[PDB]
């Protein structure tokens, strides 16, 4: 994981777009490609449509997701068994 001396990582476009959303009370899904951004406690209550490769999976943010990247809740590979 990333060092604690360098802080957590969040993409600016998302950080500014979720500050705008939490400032204006936006309930539309936050459309993003930034799967590398750590979830901050100001996304709590919003749904983030995180990319996974071919569509934006919407993930509603709860208290337990804080400190996880956005991409952990968007599975990229599809697998439904072999036989």
């Amino acid at each position: 994981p990333r060092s604690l001396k360098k802080g957590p990582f969040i993409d600016l476009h998302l950080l500014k777009k979720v500050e705008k959303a939490v400032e204006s009370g936006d309930k539309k899904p936050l459309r993003t490609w930034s799967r590398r951004s750590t979830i901050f406690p100001n996304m709590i209550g919003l749904t983030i449509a995180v990319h996974n490769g071919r569509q934006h999976v919407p993930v509603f943010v709860t208290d337990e997701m804080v400190g996880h990247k956005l991409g952990e809740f968007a599975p990229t590979r599809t697998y439904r068994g072999h036989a």
Binding site: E64, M65, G71, E72, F73, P75, H82, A83
Partner: protein
Amino acid sequence: ARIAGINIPDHKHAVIALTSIYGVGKTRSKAILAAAGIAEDVKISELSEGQIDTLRDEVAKFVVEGDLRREISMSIKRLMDLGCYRGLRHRRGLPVRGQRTKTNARTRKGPRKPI
């Protein structure tokens, strides 16, 4: 000897005898023995009940045995109920930390299942 909730092997030396606790390995046992002031080479059967009592009393600050099993289950259950990538790997029994599954996932996947 009965430290925590389980039985410690009496015939062995303290360090290994204490490592028989879910939550105490070799260096945590060494730290327990060094804070108790007992040699690690002495057998547990050859030391007094007051030494047993203080060994229990400073094992007790380490979350161990069933409390540790509760904490580990709760962390894995939190991952699985949360439904992240680590949660889905724990749910499907696949390796969680990025190992290969084309070959050599045998510990996580159990024995071989022929088609």
